Structures are given as structure tokens and as C-alpha cells.
Design an enzyme around this catalytic site. Structure first.
Site: not given
Ligand SMILES: [Mg+2]
Ligand SMILES: [Mg+2]
Ligand SMILES: [Mg+2]
Ligand SMILES: [Mg+2]
Lengths: 296, 296, 296, 296
Positions: A45, A109, A135, A140, A164, A205
Site C-alpha cells: 500500500t 471493493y 494482510y 481500505r 499483518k 511492516i
């Protein structure tokens, strides 16, 4: 399982005249290596993976692999997608280019169900023989990999070794490691690096480590050595920068900070990302004053 | 401005043996045309745009354009992307493939700022000379196009003519039309079609209309004629199906309903989407019994 | 059922030297009556019910009852509590003091279950023989009266006739009236007065009407006569003041506006409520200049 | 500052035929003392303070004070209110009744501004000369005491020494202790007791400790002694019970568990609280079997 843990950096991707500055990118990765980082994450990202072409994705991974040769530093390549067929191809491609493991963001999405998420990650994991880190970033993606789905994937798929977490939910971190203490929980939220590590998390991360790699690596290694006093001291000192680096959507602040510190040549993004407001530009500059930023 | 309004359908994309069922797709669009729909939206969210290839994107748009030729029905092609350069290319392709307009979802995942959203849509609008409808769905994208940004884009860009709102926020709908009464507010949430239309909205982009195009068409045209009593009656009758069509993430329920009604051969999705749970399959089937589903 | 609907005002409670200004209170009620209001709500949320003593609750209810005598205007007294035994006592209190009905907020802070909410309101309704309006404001109470619980209470309890909704959720408003069209849905959210009324709501309990009672009354009567064009025009014109009246927690802005308009003598609150910041004081003053504020 | 820290219990309030069971209350507190608890909190949220009379408030505080006398266990009395004049009176009464300090919940329902919260707690702090612990639980109050307001109150008011946090926001916990490391951050959310303590929190105010006081007190004492491995072990083991005790609103599950364990005579609440669903009753009973429950 084979794992990739420790202090890791979600690398920014510098642009010069709209193109990836490949020399700056390698220079920045060498700076991470020289400041104690254990792994680098190209095209996550923070690396503006959404706006890079497939060929740019490959270029960044190859530079990361080439720059880490002859060091202990691993390459955990970003390879996620909202389409399972593309994520499988991206995972296979990253393995081709020499990546040590895969970071695979939850589908954004299209909001798959937990059953769909399980089948998505099973297909990715079965496509390669290198470690796969899940992740979770619902702010997001619009979706959450539930604790049950994460644990099922960890137990059912050899390559999948942890997650993550970037969800601001320390309750979920307790839930994950209380029910499956063998997985590798990785902090994806710099401000709470220490609380995740002190609960048995095994790495970060980091966005902040782009700017302050020595401080993030030291925090992580102190925590991994069970020197919780010294890890918390660094986490507390880093809180102001950790928060200001999200005054606008990441990676707008971190790229602004790297430019202000002289670590990249131009404050350049790819649309729809753009420069911060003048107020936030000034706020970032103010916060940076209290920190010692390593050079090259 | 040139506009595309009225009763519109976010077309599902039927799959057969892993491929787009091109014959079924044309047959479903013809069914929409024959039941009073004013426009169709190929390869939107409901059409699984995320998991189609570029070739399949092209094919679905071409089938819609060809099927609507010789009718009043418009083609409002989905052409959004989280990368501005990619959204521009998709907009240009849809114009060259003969689409009447573009539906362009706000960038998902990378969460651009309002300034970034403005520059993103400005670039899209300047690349074509056909109408552009914005699409706000923060539950899926992780970002919200603010009222100020929508109004600025409407006033600054000739081809941007309105917004499809899927945010469950009637306060914002009032905000939009009180400050800019010339824009075309389009409902992107079937359950609240009537409240949006009664506040001056001029159309819907509907999931439910895949199954019940005659009812959604009647609802919209009643409302556009200010026959609010009859429009509200249909909206109230449709509430149960409008809600059950989101018991799992759209388009999982609507495709399940289309399969149960005999309107598509195969209940096939592309991963990470998959079949609903057995309990939700049965709930969808039960709710459908209340409604008269037109055939071919 | 016996009902209390139309344009209604959640009365502010003016203070003078720390005590309820009883002359001002009566004069403000007369001003509401003379500007077309159909009912007044003493000691609601807007009336700072939380910080008034039981004796001051009685005083406000008695002044409202005495002032509305000989008019068509009803007194819908606030009588809620987070303790069921106390809410029952307050309801009987208000009926004894001559109130026409009671507005009973959902229990705040202790977050009862839906079963507990049902038993709570059942006990209140059985304690009086006057109409009872439920009041859902989850942003303040931390709990939500579900549509199912509201409908069960409406159908099972003779005196419960509807709900004041302050939840910003037009989907729920559709849900309520589609499944139980006989209930009186009352807007408790000024900005969306028109959308709630146009879906079959039958009144408002307004903050803005403290300042602009003629405009809120006209909006409501236009809407009840299905003069939606005229009602929407007023709702759109009121949007700016409707929003600025919540730039800080209600009733801080409305009391500030009433003081600026010369309608109350002192800008006094009871702690923990206090004066707005100087910036918001100036914002409220600026917004007011666009509206015609009736005097006494 | 004078402080009250360590392992603390938000005492349930047992009822017998609608009255406070005073003998049970004393018996339960002695049981807490015998299992290592450092302080007891009578009439908090878990104690159903909202539905107790003033005389029942005093009785519970007096029983707690007398039962802890001659032991080192402190009494941290609940004394909050949404009205500042009332909160001041409750603080003085708790002091007069012999409490060692007060826990003062942020004003619920009326949503004061940060300036109002400051003046509210300043008035409380100046009314007594015993320690004052702030209490932030926005899910119940609808308001949040900001980090800046907490720190200002800590620095400006001699009695105010920390905050009980029940917000599921470990980021705020880092924020608080990074900017004001002298304050006593107390966990008000059992599932994350260890993460809060490992970041420098100095105690818990626990629901779970009603049932398992030995486990909660040991977890806290392990952590304060910097034995994080053993503290985390207990926190992990307690996660299932920590979560099931909130399957319905606290204190409904904990009273159900105390009744199932034979620690209280009757499963009685005061409306609007009531017994759990039959499904949640069985889930609580099932979870309890994995834990060793101390007797009297
Ligand atoms: Mg398994
Ligand atoms: Mg045409
Ligand atoms: Mg729609
Ligand atoms: Mg007509």
C-alpha cells in the site's frame, strides 16, 4: 512453517518525471538494510501498488531482490488483488522474480464473504511454495478477515504463516494469538507497534521506518529480545511522528517527510494521490523537528 | 448538460463454464429493455467488474451497446479505477465502444484526498465528451466524495452531471440538492429509492431491477411524474426483497435470485465471490415468493 | 389510537442567575403558539432535562400546560429515564400535571437489550392513559430501539402511537412505515425533516423551530398536504441553519442563536453544558443573518 | 498524587425480591478480598448504579467501606452523573461515607463539549480531597474525554490521578502515556487488560473479576511485576470468558454467571435490564465450565 518476521519496511516508490526512479529506489532499500531492517516490502500500500503497472511491479520487486542479495534481509513482495485469478498470477510472478515471501492484501471493493476469503487465500497459497502473509486493513478494503478465517487458513495451508493487522483493534490481536499462538502476528499500524509486539506479535511492516529505520528496527528488536522497557520507550517517542504520518492518507505524509528530509528528489505522486495541503505540509515539517533522521 | 437519468439497471454478468455467457447477457439486457428500463450499466459493481479481464470488460460493453441500438435505452458504462491513468483509458475505451455515458466509481483502496478526487475526476471528464456520473460508495471504497467536491466537479467540468449515491445518508442528499439543485442525484441504494427521488433525485441505478425491472421502472416513472403515492407504494412493497438482496455482499444475493427465477443457467461467480450460505440461499428463495418475476 | 402529530418544538429552557426563567419560558411558548406550532415538548433533550431538578421538571410542564390552555396546541412532555421505575413515575407525574402525552427517550448509558426496552416501554405505557411517543437517539443513548421492537410496542400497547427518530437512517424510516403504516413517525432530525415527512412521517419535533417556528410549521403543513415542492423548498432553505445548530452539541447552538436573536436574556447553561467557542459563536451569528427571525 | 491502583472489581449489586441483598453484597466483597483484589468499586456501571436509589448508593458504599476496613483493600466509589451539580453532591457523599476515592463517569446523554467536560470534572475535583479517577466509556455515554482534556485535568487538578478506559482504542492508551507518563491508566475492558498493563497501565477495573477474582488479580500483579509472559498467559486464557461476559450488555452476563456459579441467590435485575436470552444463557454456562470458580 517458513516465516518472515522482524522489522520490515513498506517501501515508498519514488517517482521522477512520472516514472519509477529506479536508482533512488535501490538507494533507499540499501539505507533500510544499513539501519537494521530484517525485510522489505516492495509494492505494498505504502508503495502505491494501486497505480503502478504490472511491469513497474516487477521492476520494484527485482530491484528489491537484487539490492538484498548478500544480506540477511528478505523480500516480502506485495502481491494482492481483488481478483483471485490475478492474485494467483501476482503471487507466482513474485516467486519468479526471487521474492522470499508474499504479502497478500484482502480483496478490496468487492467485499467477499468469509468463505470467499478462505477460497481466495487457499488458491494463492497453493500456487507457490514460499511463505504467505495475510494482510487485513478494513479501512481500505471494506472487508475484514475474521479471526476464525485467519486461523483456518493458518492451519489448512502450509505457506500461510500469519497476518499483518492494520485494523486498530487490539482485542482482535488478543483473540488471534490466544486461539492460535503459533501464527506470526505482524503490526501494520506504527503507533501501536509496541502493544502488538508485547502481546506476542513477531514483527512490524512499517511506514515510519521509511523515515526512521534505525528507530523502528531498534524498537522491534528490543521487543523481540523481551526488553519491553526499551521497546516502549521508542514507541512512546515515535508516537507524534507515527500519527502525523497519517494526517492525510498514507503514503502522502511519508513521501512528504522523505522529501523534506532530502531522501527523495521530488514530492511526486501518481493520481489520484497528490501533494498534501499546505497546512499538513507544515504540520509534518514541525513534527519532524524532534527526530534524528538517518541519511544515506 | 447532457444527462442519463431514469430507471437504470446495474447488470449482473452471467458466467458459464468460467466464461462470460454472452448469449445470456444479451437476453437479460433485452429483458430489461422490454420492461421499461431507461439505461443499463454494464460492468459496474453488480457486474463483477473487479474480476473481469480487460477483454471481458470490452465484450460486455459492446454487447450492451449493440443490444440497445434502435431503442431509447442508454448505455452508462462502468469505467472507474483506483488509478487515474487507468480510469482515463477505460473512459476513452467506453466512448470508442459506443457507450452513451460513463459511471466512474470513486478510487477504492488508496483513499485519495478530496483534492486528489477532484483531479482524478477532472482528468476523466476531460478525456471524453460523453456524460460522466460520479459514484460514491464509501462502504466499498474506503473514501467519501464530499458534497463540496461533487459540487465543484459538477460546476467545473462540463460532462460531469451528477452522482450515484450509495452511502445510506439522506442528510447528504439534502445537502447536495440544496446547494446545487441542477445536478442529477441517482439512487444507488434500492431500499431508499423513493426518498431519494422524492427529494429531487432523477433516477436509480438498481440491483433489484435485475430481478424486477418492471417494478423499479414503474417506481421511478411514478416518482418522476410526482405520483409520489404510487411510487412510495412500490418502494414499500419492495423493501423486503431490496434488503434480502444484501444479506450477503452484492451481487451474491441478486445472482442467486436470478438463478432461482430461471433467468440464468448457472450460479457461478468469480473468486473471491462465491455462492451464498445455505441459510441465505433459503432466505432469498423465501422472500422471492412475494413477488411477480417477469420472464423472457 | 390517540395521537399528537404536526409541527412540534423541543423547547429550550432559559436560565436567569442559575434558575429557570419562568416568565421567559411562558413567553417563548406563546411565541411558538402564535407561529403555527401544533405541540410543544418541555424538558426534552433540547430543554436540558438532564440537569433540571424534578421540581424544575414539574414547573416547566405546568407552565407549558397552562400556556397552551384554550388553544389547539398540545403538550408532549419529556418523561424518560434510564431507570424504568423512574420513567414510570415521571410519566404519571406528567399526566397528573395535565400533559396531553409524553415523549420518552430510550434508556441512556445502561444499554438495555431489545427485550428490556420492550418491558421498559410496556411499563411506562401501562402507567398512563395518554399517548406515548417513543424516542430513538442512539448517538446520545448508546442504544437503538430496533424496528421490530418499535413495531411490537406500537401493536401491543394501546397508548404507544409512534417514534421520534433522531438516527440519520432513512432506510429505517422506510422499514418502519412499510411494515407498520399506521404508526406516527416523527422527525427528530431537522435537516431531514422533509424526507421523513415525504415518506409518510406525520410530524417533527424540532430544534430549529425554537428560532424559526413559522418556517418549520409551514414546512410541516405543506408536507402533510402533499405540497412537496413547497415543503422541500423550505427544507432546502433551512439546511444551513439546521446544520449549524449542531456545530456543537444541542442545545448549545440553539440557545446561542436564541440569545443572539434577543429571544432570551442570558446565554446561560447548566454544567456540563457551557458556552460555545468564540469561533462557533461567530459561525452561528453569520448563518442567522440569512433568515427572518420572528420576534415576540 | 494519591492514587488507587492495582486489581479492582466493579462489584455487581445482588437483588433479593427487589431489594439490595446486603448480606450477599458483604459476602461477595469478602470473597474479593480473599482472592487478592486491591480495591472494590461499588455502584459502578456493573453495579447497576443507574437504577439504584440514593439510599441504595449509600448502603452499598457503606457495606464496601466496612467490609474492607482493617484490610488493605480500598473502596473506589462510583459517583458520576450527567449533571455537574449532582456529580459534586455524589462525590461529597462518597467521601462522607468513607470511600478512599471516586470513579466519575463522563456525562452520558447530554454530550458536553471538551470545555464542558473540563469544567465538569474540575468542579468535582475541587469538592473533595480524595483521589478522582476519570471514566471514559463513549459506547455508553455518547461522548469521549479527549487525551488533551484528560491530561489537562490530570495536570490542573490535584485529586485527578488517571482514567479508566473502556473504549477499545489501544492507540489512545499509547497517546495518553506517551504524553503524560505520570498518570494512572486503568483498564476498563477485560479482554485487553494485559495490553493496557504492558503499555504502562497500573490497574484494571474488572467485570470478570466478579466471577474469577483470583485470575484477574494475578494477571494484574504479574504485569505490574513485569512478568509479562505470565500476565499474557492469564489474559489469553481469560479471553473466552472476557468476551462472553459481553454477549449482552454488562452486567447481564456477569450476573447470569454469578447466579450459575451459585454465588448469588437470584437472577434479578432492575428494568430496563433483564435476564439474557435462553440462547445466551446457555452460551455463558458453557463458557464458564472451562474455568475454576472460587467459592466463598
Ligand atoms: Mg482448520
Ligand atoms: Mg442509443
Ligand atoms: Mg437503486
Ligand atoms: Mg407520465
Amino acid at each position: 512453517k517458513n516465516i518472515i518476521i522482524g522489522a520490515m519496511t513498506a517501501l515508498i516508490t519514488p517517482f521522477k518525471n512520472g516514472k519509477v526512479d529506479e536508482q533512488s529506489y535501490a538507494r533507499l532499500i540499501k539505507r533500510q538494510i544499513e539501519n537494521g531492517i530484517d525485510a522489505v516490502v516492495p509494492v505494498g500500500t505504502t508503495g502505491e501498488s494501486a497505480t503502478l503497472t504490472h511491469e513497474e511491479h516487477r521492476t520494484c520487486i527485482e530491484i528489491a531482490v537484487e539490492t538484498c542479495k548478500g544480506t540477511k534481509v528478505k523480500v516480502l513482495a506485495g502481491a494482492g488483488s481483488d481478483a483471485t485469478h490475478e492474485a494467483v498470477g501476482l503471487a507466482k510472478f513474485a516467486k519468479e522474480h526471487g521474492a522470499d515471501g508474499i504479502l497478500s492484501v484482502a480483496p478490496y471493493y468487492n467485499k467477499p464473504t468469509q468463505q470467499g476469503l478462505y477460497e481466495h487465500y487457499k488458491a494463492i497459497a497453493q500456487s507457490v511454495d514460499i511463505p504467505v502473509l495475510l494482510y487485513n486493513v478494513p479501512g481500505r478494503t471494506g472487508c475484514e478477515i475474521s479471526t476464525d478465517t485467519i486461523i483456518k487458513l493458518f492451519r489448512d495451508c502450509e505457506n500461510i504463516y500469519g497476518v499483518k493487522e492494520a485494523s486498530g483493534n487490539i482485542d482482535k490481536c488478543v483473540d488471534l494469538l490466544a486461539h492460535e499462538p503459533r501464527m506470526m502476528l505482524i503490526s501494520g499500524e506504527d503507533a501501536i507497534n509496541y502493544p502488538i509486539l508485547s502481546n506476542g506479535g513477531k514483527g512490524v511492516i512499517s511506514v515510519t521506518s521509511n523515515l526512521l529505520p534505525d528507530m523502528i528496527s531498534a524498537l522491534t528488536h528490543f521487543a523481540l529480545d523481551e526488553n519491553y522497557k526499551e521497546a516502549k520507550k521508542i514507541n512512546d517517542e515515535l508516537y507524534n511522528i507515527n500519527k502525523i504520518l497519517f494526517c492525510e492518507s498514507n503514503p502522502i505524509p511519508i513521501k512528504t517527510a522523505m522529501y523534506l528530509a532530502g531522501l527523495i528528489e521530488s514530492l511526486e505522486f501518481r493520481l489520484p494521490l497528490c501533494s498534501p495541503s499546505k497546512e499538513n505540509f507544515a504540520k509534518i515539517e514541525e513534527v519532524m523537528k524532534k527526530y534524528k533522521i538517518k541519511g544515506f
